Design a binder for this molecule. Structure first.
Ligand code: HEM
Ligand code: HEM
Ligand SMILES: C[C@H](O)[C@H](O)[C@H]1CNc2nc(N)[nH]c(=O)c2N1
Ligand SMILES: C[C@H](O)[C@H](O)[C@H]1CNc2nc(N)[nH]c(=O)c2N1
Ligand SMILES: Cc1cc(N)nc(C#CCN2CC(F)(F)C2)c1
Ligand SMILES: Cc1cc(N)nc(C#CCN2CC(F)(F)C2)c1
Ligand SMILES: [Zn+2]
Lengths: 415, 415
């Protein structure tokens, strides 16, 4: 019942008891493993009043058995206080300290995040008093400015009012606070980011005048209390960008690449003691491979392997010349070199994966485990020369948690 | 119940119904996914007479509903014939055609093997009349000669007598038919392959005179009908080796690397209609990354990244210089280039993973699915620039199957 996970490069063994506390389901059964399914039903997110108190009680018991005040009067009266308020309101409200705890532990419990060694250093911005989409823009601007810190990136999350009935929902329609626009050409090809071709069309549909270039920062589409969303442009002095150059190849500058400094996910859902926060933008800093491998070299994204292979002068006729691999490594050296020379926080996949193994060590000692998703933790290049490749990992779903949710434009009852 | 798997690079969707036929268990539960555990209990392998007929019946029903002769007289009489013989003997014997079918479908069902597009082109060598360890050596030599085919590698498997009581067991003690010896130095470091340091000691323990160099081909340790195993040296003209050189870097020859052409796994167990074949060496051809990434660059194997980085003249002080990544790509270009120039069959990880996607297509059409283990299918370098990275895969255990088994020297009752 008390499972073991092995590291096959060092022979370290760790014992996991934290999985006992797991509540949610994974998708796998005794006869089928769905560990490679991207969005199983369980990882996506309507609740009723009856189900709310056990989830509150369970969460309150975690928080008071955290500040080592479990079962005492301060715990019991808060237990009864929330109980009474769930009877009275069919919902409840978190204390500011409970919100900060719940949000840090959602990140802590994110099994697909290799960055969690930082989970306790998270700045939490309480935006539950927000009522309008202008208010949201203002809070989101303050988040971007704080988290960027002129390149000394700081982790942060901003938390808008929780879902109540469901038809009144705060939502950030962008998938990330800062993304580049996707424009499809009249012939068929794509300028900018093909991922956002659909979102770019919704913004033009709502009034955005597109500068139709490559790296056009998208406006924000903010929806408040269920109302229709409104467009706002992030003041460009708040959007820190890094021009990508190589430390050997001087043709690399003329490639004309740049990325943004701040990775800030805005389309997910924060769940805390049964409450649902449909708009909770959170940001950290990049691991290099996110830009250099996935953003730049995915076939359905920017897809630059061939142009980089061209200017490197490469054997591009054969697949076994490994020209794709060779050009991929140079692109990622340039991503790292550019962010570092500009003093914009970035981490390479060797540093990040070492830290995660060190984070797993700590989590099995002082916590009894660390839910981890190997499929997402192992970086998308050079997998087996990083220590996470050889580390067995148990995946399981703890709460508080970040979850996926459907896009707002498939569900919003317009008017 | 009839699950869907998505490809996130092409948007192809496939429907899996084959998982319904699954019998064995995976290790995962509704509340925990063990998709990254290397050797769960279910993937390792004693049976009694009562359990044997449903497994025979189930297997016979697959084979006759294969040559489109299901339920007929030829099926029913073989059903009753095996039934009677399980009553009479508490076991049974496969027809030669049933053995060839069962072995091809064990490979077909191997969810961790990216090579299965070839599953029906498998040469099956029936060695069930073998009685002595000399006999085994002779059969294993004929396998090596056939499968190598002077560099035009051909897939093959040799099948020794099935387990009966358990204390009489044919076993190949080597983990692969051809491996290099592992010698630990008096100071502590290691020459050759550190993986086989333990096995190398068992061979010296039994009489092997070690040439104590780097790439010393190990003798065979063959155990027949439970007797103690005996050493035999594969005639060196039967062991095809490829010296590793680079097509640009002429210092690469002086690195002094070579590998063997034939990957031939000998420590696993073939299960067919309930029968257990404890010695079933099977061979194919290499995917380049097996040698170039894992064999050469694993920290606990040959571990050559630093010496290759040295001669490349690399920024080795920092982790973020990606010198490890850069030297890894060159090692794999050289592995491919050397095998190809010598006309020894090899496949690169781009060709192999494309073929597997094409194999999955066929399997979902004419079979209803294809059990696949993403953790093992995705290659250990450049993962996301190969199409398997973006393909969702359902893992489940079908029979006939290859399974792991404990090492013989932890279980053999000596004398
Ligand atoms: C501090 C620096 C951080 C680093 C280096 C980091 C690293 C990463 C990386 C590389 C991914 C994979 C993204 C992808 O493949 O698309 C990821 C996923 C994720 N990260 Fe972190 N992250 C950081 C901060 C944070 C913060 C502050 C939070 C939450 C407050 C967070 C929560 C998540 C979640 C929820 C996911 C993916 C969840 C899913 O897909 O189910 N991360 N992280
Ligand atoms: C024909 C050329 C073949 C290629 C290119 C190929 C490719 C591969 C590769 C790269 C692996 C991973 C090995 C590792 O990471 O250590 C693998 C695993 C495997 N292959 Fe194939 N293979 C081939 C032939 C075969 C044959 C002929 C069989 C059986 C008769 C087979 C059965 C297996 C099994 C059972 C495993 C791993 C099972 C496990 O660990 O549970 N392969 N294959
Ligand atoms: C099919 C597969 O699950 C999918 O491509 C996953 C694989 N692992 C990943 N891992 C990370 N970190 N990010 C991703 O987008 C993905 N994609
Ligand atoms: C911990 C992890 O399961 C282990 O390192 C696995 C990962 N995937 C692998 N995949 C292949 N093909 N071969 C391996 O040896 C491994 N090792
Ligand atoms: C906070 C954070 C840090 C980081 N280093 N990266 C990301 C990211 C991302 C984008 N992907 C799509 C997703 F699944 F939402 C995450 C987010
Ligand atoms: C037939 C075959 C083909 C191939 N291309 N590779 C292998 C291999 C290997 C060694 N690994 C350890 C294992 F799990 F047994 C497989 C085997
Ligand atoms: Zn699973």
């Amino acid at each position: 019942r008390f499972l073991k996970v092995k590291n096959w490069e060092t022979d370290v063994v760790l014992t996991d008891t934290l999985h006992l506390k797991s509540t949610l389901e994974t998708g796998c059964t005794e006869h089928i493993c769905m560990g490679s399914i991207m969005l199983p039903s369980q990882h996506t997110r309507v609740a009723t009043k009856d189900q709310l108190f056990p989830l509150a009680k369970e969460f309150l018991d975690q928080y008071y058995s955290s500040i080592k005040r479990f079962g005492s009067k301060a715990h019991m009266d808060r237990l009864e206080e929330v109980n009474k308020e769930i009877e009275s309101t069919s919902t409840y409200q978190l204390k500011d300290t409970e919100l900060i705890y719940g949000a840090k532990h959602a990140w802590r419990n994110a099994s697909r995040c290799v960055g969690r060694i930082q989970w306790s250093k998270l700045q939490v911005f309480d935006a539950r008093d927000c009522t309008t989409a202008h208010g949201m823009f203002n809070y989101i601007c303050n988040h971007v400015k704080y988290a960027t810190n002129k390149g000394n990136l700081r982790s942060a999350i901003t938390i808008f009012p929780q879902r109540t009935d469901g038809k009144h929902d705060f939502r950030v329609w962008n998938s990330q606070l800062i993304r580049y626009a996707g424009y499809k050409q009249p012939d068929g090809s794509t300028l900018g980011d093909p991922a956002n071709v659909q979102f770019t069309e919704i913004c033009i549909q709502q009034g955005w005048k597109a500068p139709r270039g490559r790296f056009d920062v998208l406006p924000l589409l903010l929806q408040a209390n269920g109302n229709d969303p409104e467009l706002f442009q992030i003041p460009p002095e708040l959007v820190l960008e890094v021009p990508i150059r190589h430390p050997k190849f001087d043709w690399f500058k003329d490639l004309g690449l740049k990325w943004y400094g701040l990775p800030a996910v805005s389309n997910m859902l924060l769940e805390i003691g049964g409450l649902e926060f449909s708009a909770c933008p959170f940001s950290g800093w990049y691991m290099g491979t996110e830009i250099g491998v996935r953003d730049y070299c995915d076939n359905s994204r920017y897809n630059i392997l061939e142009e980089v292979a061209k200017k490197m002068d490469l054997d591009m006729r054969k697949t076994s010349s490994l020209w794709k691999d060779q050009a991929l490594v140079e692109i990622n050296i340039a991503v790292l070199y550019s962010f570092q020379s500009d003093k914009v926080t970035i981490v390479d996949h060797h540093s990040a994966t070492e830290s995660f193994i060190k984070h797993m060590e700590n989590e099995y000692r002082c916590r009894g485990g660390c839910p981890a998703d190997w499929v997402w933790i192992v970086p998308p290049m050079s997998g087996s020369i990083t220590p996470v490749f050889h580390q067995e990992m148990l995946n399981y779903r703890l709460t508080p948690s970040f979850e996926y949710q459907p896009d707002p434009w498939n569900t919003h009852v317009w008017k």
